[PDB]
Ligand binder design. Structure first.
Ligand code: GNP
Ligand code: MG
Lengths: 72, 167
């Protein structure tokens, strides 16, 4: 149960989704470690025209998706 | 700005991601959190040159060795990491080195052998085994601890220096 996330500055991560975490909570560590914070970024679901997402979207609802996080 | 593609490889649980996060953020992740794939970029000064490190932290769990081999092939230099309390991860170094040589289709690739978790008690992989193994490949061996940060910059900077002399 993971989500592939493309990150600013040509970085990327795959995160494990534990039960009951929002996207904010789910990506906090991967962003913190790279000197970013969710506050000044937007997150998008990439389709199969990307869809902008609220950071409070539940991470378990995006299992198997690909996301982009980008500076605002 | 000069860019160096570094790849951190080794068996699961040896400390590949903890070492990388110490280089990037000077912070020690005491968590268990296995990697699928993580890439990092950080700007550093080495031997008086500003350069960009692009660090691919691979999955030790070889069930994800598809994503691993896909991004290795662009790497210019490899950290081959084992943990001093895991003999299997030490014997596995041979496997990861032959994988690097296969994915690079070359005998000549910059590499550094890293023995991590040197802070732990009851070490089982002794210093002379490790130095002997590094010697057998003609590569530097660096003892590290991501917990205390010992050896962390030395491991990555040595790699960059090995990449520069390979031109
Ligand atoms: N005492 C000590 N613990 C360490 C050290 N390095 C890593 N650890 C711990 O060992 C465990 C595994 O570390 P981690 O970096 O996740 O390993 P990995 O090689 O990235 N694993 P994977 O390949 O699955 O992603 C974690 O609990 C981590 O905190 C170290 O130098 N000393
Ligand atoms: Mg890891």
């Amino acid at each position: 149960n993971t989500i592939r996330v493309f990150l600013p500055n040509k970085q990327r991560t795959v995160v494990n989704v534990r039960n009951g975490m929002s996207l904010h909570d789910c990506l906090m560590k991967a962003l913190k470690v790279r000197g970013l914070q969710p506050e000044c970024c937007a997150v998008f679901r990439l389709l199969h025209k990307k869809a902008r997402l609220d950071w409070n979207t539940d991470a378990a609802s995006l299992i198997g998706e690909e996301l982009q996080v980008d500076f605002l | 700005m000069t860019e160096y593609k570094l790849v951190v490889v080794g068996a699961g649980d040896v400390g590949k991601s903890a070492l990388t996060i110490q280089l990037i953020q000077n912070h020690f992740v005491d968590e268990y959190d296995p990697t699928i794939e993580d890439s990092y970029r950080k700007q550093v000064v080495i031997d008086g040159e500003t350069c960009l490190l692009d660090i691919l932290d691979t999955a030790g769990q070889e069930e994800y060795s598809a994503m691993r081999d896909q991004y290795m092939r662009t790497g210019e230099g490899f950290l081959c990491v084992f943990a001093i309390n895991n003999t299997k991860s030490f014997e596995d170094i041979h496997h990861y080195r032959e994988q690097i040589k296969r994915v690079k289709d070359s005998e000549d690739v910059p590499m550094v052998l890293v023995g991590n978790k040197c802070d732990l008690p009851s070490r089982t992989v002794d210093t002379k085994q490790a130095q002997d193994l590094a010697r057998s490949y003609g590569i530097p061996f660096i003892e590290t601890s991501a917990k205390t940060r010992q050896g962390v910059d030395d491991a990555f900077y040595t790699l960059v220096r090995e990449i520069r002399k390979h031109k």
